[PDB]
Design a protein around this ligand. Structure first.
Ligand SMILES: O=c1[nH]c(=O)c2nn[nH]c2[nH]1
Ligand SMILES: O=c1[nH]c(=O)c2nn[nH]c2[nH]1
Ligand SMILES: O=c1[nH]c(=O)c2nn[nH]c2[nH]1
Ligand SMILES: O=c1[nH]c(=O)c2nn[nH]c2[nH]1
Ligand SMILES: [Cl-]
Ligand SMILES: [Cl-]
Lengths: 295, 295, 296, 296
């Protein structure tokens, strides 16, 4: 392994070009983003054989300072004319490889810093403020991109992946976990009606990477919509396990978004212990599942 | 100082009696709580001269186990027939002092564990789910109560305080900070248009402690409403400082809720550094303000 | 209430004057501090009735910017010629009130950012490095000070307290918790041999605030020595509860340090649940706690 | 992908067999582990094509409950008779695949929960306590193992890696960063004497996985020794960058431990900003990082 970079590059841009014309779906009201406030936390990693001597000899001749990568990212957010994190990452990746010809590969993560609307009384009635927003520490969209320079000097995206992270859902009834292996190590009672509490990270890949950029918004898959699919399917389903639930969420996502190639899940179980029904937090050990549905 | 207790007593109650009939205000749509899911994190502290020898002699004869206080709280959430955290704390405080006659004083904190509604498609249309909720790591209501046993053996609430914690608001324009002292220690530039980013903890006290309990919902002050007042006033105000803003929020709260005696603010400044306008996270040091408005 | 200030003012100073000349105790080998690296996190709060219109009218004429307070703290750490956080707080407080005559009161917290020594081989032997240090996220020393300006423009310290925070101690055996109330709310079993795990925050107050500054270091009480007393007493004691333990720790402290007026304890219970060798695991979140003062 | 498992399986064992008989190096006084208290946080992942219908049809017939995996881990810590996290992981992995024949692969992480010794006075002298320990939130040792079941029901380790995580080192002087690219994106000034502060995660892989278990302890590589090498090399070196430093640390490691095949580094830059004595303060959040492997 040989690479280096800069993490936690927070950047806040006001009045980015709004995202409009997004194809809606029955599970979600989402149609676009106003982009009055556009926050993203970026991580950049770059590699290339010519970086070797910066490690082996302490030769900094070919080192773009990691501090300079932060400048690069933040300046490019100022000049980005697109409408999505995915497109911003492509802009950064392309501009960076174009600028630094000794770099063979660049990997980017972009994590949304989400802000929610708030109420203000405008003259006489409540409405959404166009100035005051609430910082949310809940779920947030993500994006990932890897781009390489080929031997013929062309630039190629080798990997792209969008996601929703930090979604925490509890369904008070309509969940079971029964029929699992009962042997010498099994002390968990069967439960025909548990308040299943799951953390979800959902990530998707497009059949055609262009669709991720939002240029044709009709083909863009929004994390807001993925969220509302997850909650909708959770509501509709008499779950039989987390495994069972996330497969059904995945199938619905692929059905709603045929331009997607796959959906990947990282789930955790945080179901409370039962002790009017009252519950309490469990001990720290948490179950998890990881699973890919493909189109 | 001599007291002891139990903290992080999480308790989750389903289908608590709903809170209804709350007097509304122009800044907020709030009218009640469905209480399908009622989460609270409780801290209990108890004191009394008769506890001395548990410290000085290792005599546990008069020690209610802190583990038993957790049981006490969680069982009482199961039997609570009221509608607010404030009333739940009074129920716990009264029942505890009634049960343990060697305890002279009890202090309680109750912190809401908030859950937000989610979308589910019911047959054909999107609607709020009655089963699936989203755990929120954003702002949350709080409550505080101190109750003592008097020499004549009556029980008296000596202190009560409700609050909203963890509110994080950023207003992209319409804020200034100018005219402050410029001397040998001053390097901050004046700013006539900054994206003021403030954290708020807002706490209020009632003229009549009965109003906090929600028995007559007409007199109850909801944290949801305090929130929407704060965002509304933030929107309306060309702020001149955080100090200036929180005074104006306080005045509005007292005007809307004449049954309140005071409002107390704990604010922090997290305004981003400026570097299309792009900003970034500042260094760690944060300003703060603390201030009480009284009716 | 009315005050404002600045928090999380981290400041790292190199080559502060060493602390030496301290008085030893049986429980502790502590003999001083090198101060190659002296890290402190500072929080400052100021008050004064002349600040009212900064709230009520948005008038910043008498506002020291909280950004300026950060500059003030860090610049005074560069010029500080003493040897303790406690003395540093007094330096900042007195300088600040002298500088800003409309401020009537100032409160300061300083929390050590501790660093530990590391090994290095040089000139044929291994020894502690004078250059490379390890940042510790374990326990740390604390200091608190409040100072007011009187009507006649004199300044007075009105409260001072030192401390040790974040001490996390587990004793594997030699602890019991029995004989507590067993009623309808009791499911905890009696346990004659538990592996008591306590978090400890220990704070002390001096009879004479001057002893806190280090200027006559033989009268200073070091957080390192307080830690060592805590661990020794825990080892020595067949504990009957955390309450029992902390009273005993506080008595030894006031016995070892007759210049102290009182010691205050904030303890939390984080004892593991028991599940061949003995194995334990982390408990559910709810934690017991105790708060208790021992006085001379 | 398809797998499921259990994380944050904390487990604390008393009086595990001591680790002794290890081979020393100049950089480190490490000579073994007492194991009065042996804490580990374990994460387990399992896979197998026979798990598909648990996802696609909600059929739990072949689901080992993740709750049961936690029980499995903790019970095997009680019966484990070895001396390392690495050997413990192999014990759990082999037992689990033997128990559950439909599982084809298992991956395990174990992270040390470290505890430090404390002082206590007894029988007329002060010495380290055999009962009271201090929980450390600083660096800790790690271990990773993956094991698969072959078609013929044999089991094989397919990957093994040990490590040290959370090492936080600041060197106050004797570090430079100069000569990097200065273009339109460069605002960082050249600095010939900076107080380099690095976070280090160091992982190593053995030529022979058996050497990782402790069974012949003279061939074991201890995280404690790796730490000491890291700090020594940092002290010794006039660093020209973090990149420069970590390559040098990795070469010394592979020189000291010829039984290692490779060492891998994850470093982060957390160097303070400079603001009488020298004073520094915490930087803005963005942090540089490096990832690099040195091989024999
Ligand atoms: O949904 C679940 N899947 C599992 O594998 C499991 N194991 N314990 N509880 C569980 N719940
Ligand atoms: O609103 C503010 N109040 C203050 O006191 C201050 N100081 N720096 N920035 C500030 N902003
Ligand atoms: O030391 C203890 N004190 C207590 O009050 C207590 N309550 N439960 N366990 C306890 N342990
Ligand atoms: O050691 C360093 N390596 C780097 O790549 C770098 N970039 N900015 N500062 C740096 N320091
Ligand atoms: Cl001594
Ligand atoms: Cl040696």
């Amino acid at each position: 392994v040989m690479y280096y970079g800069k993490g936690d590059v927070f950047a806040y841009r006001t009045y980015l070009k709004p995202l409009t014309g997004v194809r809606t779906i029955p599970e979600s009201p989402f149609s676009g983003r106003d982009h009055i406030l556009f926050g993203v936390n970026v991580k950049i990693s770059v590699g290339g054989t010519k970086l070797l001597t910066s490690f082996t000899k302490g030769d900094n001749s070919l080192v773009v300072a990691t501090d300079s990568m932060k400048n690069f990212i933040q300046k490019h957010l100022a000049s980005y004319t697109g409408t999505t994190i995915e497109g911003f990452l492509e802009y950064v990746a392309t501009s960076f490889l174009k600028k630094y010809s000794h770099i063979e590969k660049i990997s980017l993560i972009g994590e949304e810093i989400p802000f929610e609307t708030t109420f203000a009384v405008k003259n006489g009635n409540r409405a959404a403020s166009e100035l005051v927003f609430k910082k949310s520490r809940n779920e947030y969209a993500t994006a990932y991109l890897n781009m390489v320079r080929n031997e013929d000097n062309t630039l190629n995206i080798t990997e792209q992946q969008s996601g929703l992270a930090g979604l925490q859902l509890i369904k008070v009834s309509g969940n079971s976990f029964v029929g699992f292996i009962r042997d010498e190590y099994t002390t968990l009672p069967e439960d025909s009606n548990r308040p299943l509490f799951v953390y979800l990270n959902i990530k998707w890949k497009y059949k055609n990477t262009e669709d991720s950029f939002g240029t044709n918004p009709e083909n863009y898959v929004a994390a807001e919509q993925i969220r509302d699919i997850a909650t909708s399917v959770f509501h509709e389903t008499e779950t039989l396990s987390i495994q069972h639930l996330i497969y059904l969420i995945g199938r619905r996502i692929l059905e709603r978004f045929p331009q997607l190639q796959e959906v990947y899940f990282e789930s955790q179980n945080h179901t409370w212990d039962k002790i009017g029904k009252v519950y309490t937090e469990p001990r720290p050990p948490y179950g998890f599942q990881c699973f890919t549905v493909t189109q």
